[PDB]
Design an enzyme around this catalytic site. Sequence first.
Site, short mmCIF file in Angstrom:
data_model
loop_
_atom_site.label_atom_id
_atom_site.label_comp_id
_atom_site.label_asym_id
_atom_site.label_seq_id
_atom_site.Cartn_x
_atom_site.Cartn_y
_atom_site.Cartn_z
N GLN A 1 -0.42 8.08 -6.61
CA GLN A 1 -0.70 8.70 -5.29
C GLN A 1 0.58 9.29 -4.67
O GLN A 1 0.44 10.20 -3.82
CB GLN A 1 -1.35 7.69 -4.34
CG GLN A 1 -2.86 7.60 -4.51
CD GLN A 1 -3.54 8.91 -4.18
OE1 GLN A 1 -3.69 9.28 -3.02
NE2 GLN A 1 -3.96 9.62 -5.21
N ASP B 1 0.87 -1.21 0.00
CA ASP B 1 0.00 0.00 0.00
C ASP B 1 0.90 1.25 0.00
O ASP B 1 1.89 1.25 0.76
CB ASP B 1 -0.95 -0.05 1.20
CG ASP B 1 -1.87 1.15 1.35
OD1 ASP B 1 -2.64 1.43 0.40
OD2 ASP B 1 -1.81 1.81 2.42
N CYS C 1 -7.68 -1.59 -6.56
CA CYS C 1 -6.84 -1.90 -5.37
C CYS C 1 -7.69 -1.58 -4.14
O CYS C 1 -8.74 -2.24 -3.96
CB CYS C 1 -5.52 -1.13 -5.44
SG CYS C 1 -5.68 0.60 -5.98
N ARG D 1 -2.05 2.28 -7.09
CA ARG D 1 -1.57 1.04 -7.74
C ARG D 1 -2.27 0.89 -9.10
O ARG D 1 -1.56 0.69 -10.12
CB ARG D 1 -1.77 -0.15 -6.78
CG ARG D 1 -0.67 -0.25 -5.73
CD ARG D 1 -0.92 -1.23 -4.60
NE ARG D 1 -1.96 -0.80 -3.68
CZ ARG D 1 -2.35 -1.48 -2.61
NH1 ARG D 1 -1.78 -2.64 -2.31
NH2 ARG D 1 -3.32 -1.01 -1.84
N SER D 2 -3.60 1.05 -9.12
CA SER D 2 -4.44 0.97 -10.33
C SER D 2 -3.92 1.96 -11.37
O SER D 2 -3.91 1.62 -12.54
CB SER D 2 -5.90 1.26 -9.99
OG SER D 2 -6.47 0.28 -9.13
#
Length: 297
Positions: free
Chosen positions: A262, A181, A215, A221-222
Amino acid sequence: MEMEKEFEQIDKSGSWAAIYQDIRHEASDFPSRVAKLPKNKNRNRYRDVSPFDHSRIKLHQEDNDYINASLIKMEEAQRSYILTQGPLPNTVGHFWEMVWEQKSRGVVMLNRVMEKGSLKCAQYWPQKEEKEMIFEDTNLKLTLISEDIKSYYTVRQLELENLTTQETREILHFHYTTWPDFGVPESPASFLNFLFKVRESGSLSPEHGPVVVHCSAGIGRSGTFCLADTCLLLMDKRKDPSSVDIKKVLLEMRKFRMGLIQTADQLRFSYLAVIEGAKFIMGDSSVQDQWKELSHE
Ligand SMILES: CC(=O)c1ccc(OCC(=O)O)cc1
């Protein structure tokens, strides 16, 4: 500017955090009015992650058509993706209704059900052949058909039955089980080996609905997955790795869903993935076998 040289320039100057903030500063801003209606509060996992109204996926029901999911349409690459949040206990029915209505072949999952000792999404698929799931709200049945487990990732054959019509489809579940994460994958080679497995399945091909990728929030992540897929595809079409600006691809993708990528490390990894993957698109087919080996799957 060859991204490989832009890369070494940013790396030696340590300006990753500065590049990233420029992208954040210029990123599109569009209304998310449906997401923030009071009736939809329990359909959103995070308060600060919403689909724009212009690109949101609509459920085909008169009740409430809302799901936290966005259609990213990349006109030149001729690829579409649906990015969505990890399903909630009360949206598992909605998730499989979207997969059905949009005619998707593949689901790509980039998170684990539990990370950092907290729940990141619902257990939304069956774990045993003989224990099928039924979603009463959306009138669907889901059955595990087969499971192929490897070091870092697992591929599942699922059967989705529309109980209303008794039609069935095979859905492929591609689960990446190693991506921290708010972090970047282990090796670059490992990520790319996963990416080419999804491609070889035909889940990304235009004869199917758009792939569903998720995710936790469906932006970090996506974001990394569909940015790398699209940049490598653009390299193939015009054959100029140079004629590819990853920052401009990202800003284009951010017209369809907020916050894609992110952290400044996710942006850096994206560069590594595309630079390393380009050592194939441009005719070194062997490199694929190398990634598989280096990935120790
Ligand atoms: C039309 C489309 O999908 C698109 C493709 C590429 C874009 O920026 C990167 C570049 O042109 O090198 C922007 C948009």
